[model samples]
Target: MKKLVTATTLTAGIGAAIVGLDHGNEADAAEQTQPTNQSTTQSTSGSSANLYTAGQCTWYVYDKVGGNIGSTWGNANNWASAASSAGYTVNNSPEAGSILQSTAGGYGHVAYVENVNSDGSVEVSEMNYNGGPFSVSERTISAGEASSYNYIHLN
Candidate 1:
């Protein structure tokens, strides 16, 4: 006869596993060119001022944030350095409306912070999430995990 394990240890292990997986895929940088079949009406901003592509993360952030972001910032991964070079403060403190830069995956990624929750989580508004290039979505990042990521402060 085999002995049964306790439920407390099993529950704890699952919780840790879930948190790890959540953080791993949140900042995915894989670009998806194909548009989803869902007829989501995206407001095409006609402002020719921003240089980023239509469905890119940088484009969405620039379209919404509208600051000193230059046309030659390159990719989302390079935005932190470019913004810094362009005289912007890059730090770990997440603020509402600040740009969150994640160089975790391929090509890197960027997002606009909608708000920071009292529980130490950040709500990020972004595009191109989960391969949906033309859609805007929000993601919540744990404060512990986001502390390592970079945030671009624009006044």
Candidate 2:
């Protein structure tokens, strides 16, 4: 069987590598172009975002979060259901122990739970962000910024 790294493991590894560095405002040096189909009505459930690709969201929901829920349903409705089934709650704002979801038309993005910065900001890493093998890059966005997806709180 191919050794696959779960989203949580990957994020934790990346987090460990960047320890003690200020990652709050780090952004991709190169601005990635959004997908051609930028529609917000597309299905991104279970789709892999290439972490190596540009323009992909930088967030991922750990496998633990998705696995416990027992289904690969995408979208806000599915998110709520998964959270409920897993004995968790969803939130809009980014907070520690929350999953930041992409607001894009498809299930374009998902990221692990992290603490909101002192400035009330949060960082995220795209699991399958662009369907490629790459490191988790820190992404900073303004509060209430128009995103392609929404954030889901788990536990």
Candidate 3:
């Protein structure tokens, strides 16, 4: 069974991989797997503002991919719909290469899975857009953040 890590945990565990607002170095991190015991839920524990920003970032990235998905207010649900249209499955239990979605009250966001921690946690990498082309970051977040949506498993 694999382990999952959250955004907070990722920041604390592997800060080196995450480059904040600084746009000096941009590289794709190595891929990771999701744990077996991972579950999805809809809870607002972390920074909702951050999550919202992340969701906007997600939509911006997806748009670049030619995906005509709109960015809504919800967290996980928005991600689920967009990813689904892009040929991904949204669920709680995440696979090795899956998109973790956050949906609550008709809003949602998404991030790419880098790996599942040895302790059953999820490490996610996201391409964000603030004032530049795109900024990527890896964070360990809880499945509960995506309560409205599920894991969007990519093939």
What is the lDDT for 86 in model 1? 58
lDDT of 2: 0.47
Model 2: per-residue Cα lDDT over 7-120, one tens digit each: 754434333444475556632232334454432322222323332323433313444244333344444335545655544455576665456655455654466644556665
- Give the alpha-carbon lDDT of every model: 0.72, 0.47, 0.51
Candidate 1 residue 154 C-alpha distance from true site, Å:
0.4
lDDT, candidate 3, 103-147, per-residue tens: 543555566667766665677777654656566667776545433
Top-scoring candidate (lDDT): 1
User: What are the TM-scores, per candidate, against the unseen true structure?
Assistant: 0.61, 0.42, 0.42
Best by the TM-score measure: 1
> How do the residues 95-145 of candidate 1 rate in per-residue lDDT, one tens digit apiece?
776788888788888888889998989988877556665567778999997
lDDT, candidate 3, at 50: 28
**Candidates 1 and 3 compared by TM-score, better number:** 1
How many steric overlaps are in each model, in order? Answer: 0, 26, 34
